[PDB]
Amino acid sequence: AVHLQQSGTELVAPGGGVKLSCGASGYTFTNYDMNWVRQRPGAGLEWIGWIFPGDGSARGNEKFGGAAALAAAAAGGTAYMGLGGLSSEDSGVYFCARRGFAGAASFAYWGQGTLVTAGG
């Protein structure tokens, strides 16, 4: 029973960052890298970046260079994505995603999504 459980809805004001979480269970956390994806109405599904729980590596989409900080906490089996200085351009649903095999970077496991809404 592999599973990714994400945290609740976020109502955030301009400026001010927010850090989201993803509790991973059913598999050894460090064995797989955690990925993050963004989904907005227009603009679509966009890959954010990844992090390895084995050593803390961080490869990120140029498009999210400053906006996202991917940190992971072992003993938590938990992953986090800290978002920057939220403008409305950041309002959307954020997904926690993992692979299934290790010969396919396809995302076979997904969190249920965390809705972030930026309003003042």
């Binding site: 966009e46 890959w47 999504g113």
Partner: protein
């Protein structure tokens, strides 16, 4: 950045019919391509891995082909619960990117 184009935002079909959605990566991404299905309020579900391989638990009416720059997702006999969104994704070179999606809808 590789670009995945799903030309048909919407595609009309019927229950019991056959459909084919197409994707076109701007570059040759060989076989590094995935297909996902998404239903409202839900996260994407992996349907196809490596261009033509089914994922686990994924039904037989779901097929996919391609291996180069053009890829096609296919449903042998469409069921009422397949009238969702299908996303294209390239995992050949970063940054990973997704197509804009194709929503299947019932013709009437």
């Amino acid at each position: 950045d590789i670009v995945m184009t799903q030309s048909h935002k919407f595609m009309s079909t019927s229950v019991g019919d056959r459909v084919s959605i197409t994707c076109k990566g701007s570059q040759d991404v060989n076989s590094a391509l995935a297909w996902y299905q998404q239903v409202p309020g839900q996260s994407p579900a992996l349907l196809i891995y490596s261009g033509s391989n089914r994922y686990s638990g994924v039904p037989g009416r779901f097929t996919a082909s391609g291996g180069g720059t053009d890829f096609s997702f296919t449903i042998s006999s469409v069921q009422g619960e397949d009238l969702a969104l299908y996303y294209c994704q390239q995992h050949y070179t970063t940054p990973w990117t997704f197509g804009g999606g194709t929503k299947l809808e019932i013709k009437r």
